[PDB]
Design a protein around this ligand. Sequence first.
Ligand SMILES: *C(=O)N1C[C@H](NOS(=O)(=O)O)CC[C@H]1C(N)=O
Length: 263
Amino acid sequence: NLVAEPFAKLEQDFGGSIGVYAMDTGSGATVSYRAEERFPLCSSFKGFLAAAVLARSQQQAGLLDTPIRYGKNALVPWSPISEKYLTTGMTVAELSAAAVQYSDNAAANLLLKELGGPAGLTAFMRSIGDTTFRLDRWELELNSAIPGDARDTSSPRAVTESLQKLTLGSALAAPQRQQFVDWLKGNTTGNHRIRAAVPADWAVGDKTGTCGVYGTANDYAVVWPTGRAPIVLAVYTRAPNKKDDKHSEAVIAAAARLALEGL
Ligand SMILES: *C(=O)N1C[C@H](NOS(=O)(=O)O)CC[C@H]1C(N)=O
């Protein structure tokens, strides 16, 4: 219908699959396209990982400033922050900021270990009412993005609903929610994705993912307009099925534009 056609055309031009869910928290209006289909999370799970850390900080005093000593064996490719602190270590909060804002892989594994692994993060997501999210593997294996594999996936609607609960709703206490918002607002990896769709004088917090298959990538965000209620949205892609020419970032930005225009 009228709502789906601009997304279907964008998806047809892209050649893969796109999933979009957006909610206007002022009016309750939504935009939905393949919003209940599963897509690989890849690095985007790191936002929810940081939220799970903050949930634990409601119960364990001093957790955030607790140093985690790690060695070279914890490092994996794309660990730009943790590679600089081998001899000094990093605190839980510093690891969380690195995982969110630089998508640091070693930091994400260290925090997963603190939380009881992929099963522990999945249990946290269940505890906030997310029945779709599943994390099954660690970095780097979780990025495999095998078509039809449900491991390490969620849906755009579940991502958006969980993000809303954690940044604007009641799933975290206010100081924790503000810290999550601040980490998302300072993300450095999303400048070509949802942020490319928003007016400059708005504000955005986001977390990206870029899977091991070109064309499978994603971004979710809270967007704060001027003078009206925030919008929460998620845009996920799956690569065309049966070398950097998939323009996945442009597709994510274009889908975000349609959502913000149509809302
Ligand atoms: C996350 O999906 N990853 C971490 C890193 N940065 O990508 S992101 O900025 O889009 O999050 C490299 C790609 C990927 C990975 N393979 O771990």
